[PDB]
Amino acid sequence: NSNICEVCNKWGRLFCCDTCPRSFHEHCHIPSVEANKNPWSCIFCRIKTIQERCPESQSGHQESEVLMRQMLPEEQLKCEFLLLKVYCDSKSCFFASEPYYNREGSQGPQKPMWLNKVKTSLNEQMYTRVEGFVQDMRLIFHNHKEFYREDKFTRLGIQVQDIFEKNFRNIFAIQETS
Numbered sequence: 001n002s003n004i005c006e007v008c009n010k011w012g013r014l015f016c017c018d019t020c021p022r023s024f025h026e027h028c029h030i031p032s033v034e035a036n037k038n039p040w041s042c043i044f045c046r047i048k049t050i051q052e053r054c055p056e057s058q059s060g061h062q063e064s065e066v067l068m069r070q071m072l073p074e075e076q077l078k079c080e081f082l083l084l085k086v087y088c089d090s091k092s093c094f095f096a097s098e099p100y101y102n103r104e105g106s107q108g109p110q111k112p113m114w115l116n117k118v119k120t121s122l123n124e125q126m127y128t129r130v131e132g133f134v135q136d137m138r139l140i141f142h143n144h145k146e147f148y149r150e151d152k153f154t155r156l157g158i159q160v161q162d163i164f165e166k167n168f169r170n171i172f173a174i175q176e177t178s
């Protein structure tokens with residue numbers, strides 16, 4: 001197994017996957033690493049199993065269909081993994097905890113949003129469809145773009161949104177287009 005957490009790339013108290021060489025901190029894994037379960041399989045392994053059980057699940061899909069899916073166990077898992085993939089980028093630090101807004105010439109968003117709030121919402125099964133989760137994730141970056149206006153710091157939102165969108169298209173097998 002790896003000697004650093006797959007998400008934050010730090011050592012510490014790590015839990016090891018039994019089916020692949022990744023390791024995690026307890027709360028870096030999503031969902032949080034389970035109390036017992038020997039053997040234990042990480043989310044990367046669980047996602048791979050879905051695809052192997054139903055190879056046709058990798059054929060292309062329309063985003064509009066994906067968004068209307070109900071949050072059954074498999075879609076819940078895919079959203080958890082997509083959230084995890086965003087936390088894997090170090091620039092997610094800017095969007096993790098609850099923001100505050102006091103900048104000359106700007107007004108804070110009507111509906112603040114951040115990664116830890118989405119994480120909690122997923123944990124508490126607050127989303128009924130994929131659309132709920134995707135809307136909140138996109139709202140994080142849209143709020144950032146609007147607030148920071150022409151400051152170059154706006155680019156961090158563009159950057160992290162691109163990681164989200166690429167991973168969304170991969171995990172949910174969105175039909176490739178020009």
Ligand SMILES: [Zn+2]
Pocket residue numbers: 005006007008009010024025028
């Ligand atoms: Zn970690």
Ligand SMILES: [Zn+2]
Pocket residue numbers: 017018019020021022041042043044045
């Ligand atoms: Zn694994």
Ligand SMILES: [Zn+2]
Pocket residue numbers: 053054055056057
């Ligand atoms: Zn199948």
